[PDB]
Design a protein around this ligand. Structure first.
Ligand code: FV9
Lengths: 254, 277
């Protein structure tokens, strides 16, 4: 009656706490820098942007809560992972609810293909997470070619959501999927290299070593620069973009 | 020959659905189907749209049990080990979540905009059900009978309303079944609770399988702060006696609300059959 509507509204506050626990962790205020850069082509409406951002950022973190459980991570960016605090069921709930609150949010774009797209990209992400666990469960390191596959499914899976949602809400229609893989790998491999120089996570240098001390760092350096090159050569054939290339050349520090 | 991505891909689908399949093969998925067919005697929906509404409902159900078992730390389900104790927590979470989104994809094929609206609400609801369940658990508290019923209509007992609601989108039938659907949702659940018990020299949180069950709750509220040989204790409290009473009492209101919607032979057959327990 009365008491049930209080006890219910409460549960929704509670439900977001693991999601919030992940928001507050250090860095990943730099995601925002990136989508803003992409808007120098898409010229998207400020109000559709804020929702595409809200969504992307919801799906991301909900997807990390699961990824940590699934990877049996112990820490994330140095702090304990969400499940070791709130506990697995409490987390599963929060991520899943947040994913669906993000559906609800995409519905507000009022665009039938946006749900179509969200659904595809999530389905993709789950297959990535799929493989990741498959390998883990079978005590197996994936090959370099397979590692990249998983990243484009998981990472290009959720770059591609955002850039693709925005491109729905733009008269810009030239092909960024090419550029987005080049960035997806770039970002990942970099964050792998940085992180080393794992937490139950397959990482580009460890994989290259394992498929012969080794100087995978030497190879990873080489492999990273080589993408950045293809970043610029595909950035240009899309009429160029100052904001983005600033954020690339900045990041090529590591 | 980069048939390597074609293999690596076909594989992932097989893998991803294995825990979902593991749950299908446990007994009698033919009884959900029996029910929605009965409801079509009012909605007169197209056979092909029905099949999808059914596929969806049935996907959401099982995916929702895979999670329920993890979350309730169940050990067994319908006698066999639970899905996660075989395939393992991460592998299961993945499969349920993927299945939920394959059900989105499926609802999209109904090609009617309100269907996504509805699915999204029902899922969000389901999660709040799971919400409550753990709220109570975390607070070391047994919920009231009143509250238990609320949780059931929110959660997996809820999932009739998705289907009947999807169907009613595709129908010029517009009279109110939500009333009848609670009466049925509780009926179905409480029955499956009673059955599950009447099925050792076991303890209760063994038999319930770490689950809130109508008879155990009624017992616990009879002999501001916080609430051997089970079966005979429950009969010594006679929750079984009360559950019998409480079940029949709904079935009665099933019939009295079935009728004020112009009556329905198919359904009433399936009720009176099921009233066996
Ligand atoms: O891993 C994904 N994206 C991606 C790509 C490049 C870097 C990162 C990333 N990676 C992180 N560290 C590592 P992890 O995800 O194991 O914490 P990763 O490099 O192996 O993904 C962290 C940690 C705190 S914020 C963060 N962001 C994530 C990812 C996760 C969930 C999705 F739904 C989609 C992509």
């Amino acid at each position: 009656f009365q008491s049930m509507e209080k006890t219910q509204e409460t549960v929704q506050r509670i439900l977001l706490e693991p999601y919030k626990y992940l928001l507050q962790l250090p860095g990943k205020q730099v995601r925002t820098k990136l989508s803003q850069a992409f808007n120098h082509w898409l010229k998207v409406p400020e109000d559709k942007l804020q929702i595409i951002i809200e969504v992307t950022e919801m799906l991301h973190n909900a997807s990390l809560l699961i990824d940590d459980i699934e990877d049996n991570s112990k820490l994330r960016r140095g702090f304990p992972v969400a499940h070791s605090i709130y506990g697995i069921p409490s987390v599963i709930n929060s991520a899943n609810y947040v994913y669906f609150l993000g559906l609800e949010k995409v519905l507000t774009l009022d665009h039938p293909d946006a749900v179509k797209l969200f659904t595809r990209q999530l389905l993709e992400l789950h297959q990535g997470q799929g493989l990741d666990i498959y390998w883990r469960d079978n005590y197996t390191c994936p090959t370099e070619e397979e590692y990249k596959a998983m990243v484009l499914q998981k990472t290009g899976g959720l770059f591609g959501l955002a850039v693709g949602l925005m491109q729905l809400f733009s008269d810009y229609k030239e092909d960024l999927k090419p550029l987005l893989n080049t960035l997806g790998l770039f970002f990942q491999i970099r964050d792998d290299y940085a992180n080393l120089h794992t937490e139950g996570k397959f990482s580009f240098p460890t994989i290259h070593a394992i498929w012969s001390d080794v100087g995978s760092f030497e190879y990873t350096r080489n492999t990273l620069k080589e993408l950045e090159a293809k970043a610029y050569k595909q950035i240009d054939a899309r009429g160029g973009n100052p904001e983005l290339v600033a954020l690339v050349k900045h990041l090529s520090k590591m």
